[PDB]
Design a protein around this ligand. Structure first.
Ligand SMILES: Cc1cncc2cccc(S(=O)(=O)N3CCCN(C(=O)CN)C[C@@H]3C)c12
Length: 321
């Protein structure tokens, strides 16, 4: 099938975005950094390890559902084009394409991410594996370029992994209204949401006894040190995984053991860390079944399917425009 990549990000947009996030994020109280910056090369290898950890259930909880329900997703959505808000490198991607292909209605795959190299490998993969499929990879980000996604016949947008949990309720509702707006009648959105559960089970999923999440979390300091000429005594920052009972969300913090002071060279900046001061690096909001349909209805979408794994740990929503 025909391949195409459209690149809406300038050659520097990545490093430019990094430069302002840590510049602004290190001057907040408390200091905070978006979780997008975890995922350099060693960060992605660390995450793929995380998905294989016994304690990290969401990855396998969502694959359990998708293995069982993919033909339903297809027959409900009846979509000829699968739009992935992600890299397209997972096996869940394949299960969704297989379902659409089995239905007989698969024409077009649209991977949508901010890394053209990943989009290209993905585009080659899907081209070698699915003759007949047009791959129209789009390289952009959500706030500006969701409008650049092609139209096709009838579109299944897919945002899995409970990645939507990284948006607190403000940006979450804003992200969904805008995604609802680029959607048109007949299109649907397939949404993965990790569910509220035993707080011990939640914290343990982000502080594995093996420490793989710990080095994954402090890898954002390794990224800032490398890409921006900084001097984080990375080991002096302790991994902290918190359950926030009032907000119902996991939080990953890096706690500074003793007073620290750090200079970020590319930004001519120096920031201080009090002894025991924490810096927020990721939020995973945990969800409730009807509250997810509610949020989808407030974005202008209407849920028509809900599914969980055998234990009720993870949920997948299907929502029509
Ligand atoms: C989904 C996605 C969409 N668009 C751009 C992306 C750019 C880089 C990485 C991903 S991502 O796929 O690597 N992503 C990241 C956030 C944490 N996530 C959690 O689940 C936390 N509990 C989910 C999952 C690991 C992107």
């Amino acid at each position: 099938g025909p391949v195409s990549v459209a690149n809406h990000l300038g050659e520097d947009a990545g490093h430019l975005a990094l430069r302002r996030d840590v510049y602004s994020g290190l001057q907040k109280t408390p200091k905070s950094l978006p979780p997008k910056w975890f995922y350099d090369t060693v960060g992605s290898e660390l995450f793929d390890q995380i998905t294989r950890l016994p304690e990290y259930y969401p990855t396998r909880a969502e694959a359990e559902i998708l293995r069982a329900r993919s033909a339903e997703v297809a027959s409900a959505c009846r979509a000829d084009t699968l739009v992935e808000l992600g890299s397209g490198t997972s096996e869940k991607t394949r299960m969704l394409l297989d379902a659409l292909r089995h239905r007989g209605s698969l024409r077009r795959f649209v991977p949508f991410d901010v890394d053209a190299s990943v989009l290209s490998a993905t585009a080659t993969a899907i081209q070698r594996e699915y003759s007949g499929v047009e791959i129209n990879a789009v390289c952009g980000d959500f706030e500006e370029h969701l409008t650049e996604i092609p139209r096709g016949g009838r579109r299944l947008f897919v945002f899995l992994g409970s990645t939507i949990g990284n948006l607190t309720p403000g940006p979450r509702a804003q992200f969904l209204t805008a995604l609802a707006g680029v959607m048109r009648p007949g299109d649907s959105l397939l949404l993965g949401t990790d569910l509220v559960k035993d707080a011990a089970r939640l914290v343990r999923a982000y502080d594995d006894p093996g420490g793989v999440t710990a080095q994954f979390n402090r890898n954002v300091l390794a990224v800032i040190n490398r890409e921006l000429e900084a001097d984080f005594d990375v080991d002096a920052f302790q991994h902290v995984a918190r359950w926030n009972s009032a907000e119902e969300r996991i939080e990953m913090w890096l706690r500074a053991d003793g007073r620290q002071r750090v200079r970020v060279g590319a930004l001519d900046l120096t920031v201080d860390f009090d002894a025991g001061e924490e810096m927020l690096t990721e939020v995973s909001c945990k969800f409730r079944p009807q509250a997810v349909g509610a949020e989808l209805a407030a974005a202008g979408l209407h849920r028509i399917r809900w599914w969980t794994d055998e234990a009720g740990d993870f949920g997948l929503s299907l929502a029509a425009k």
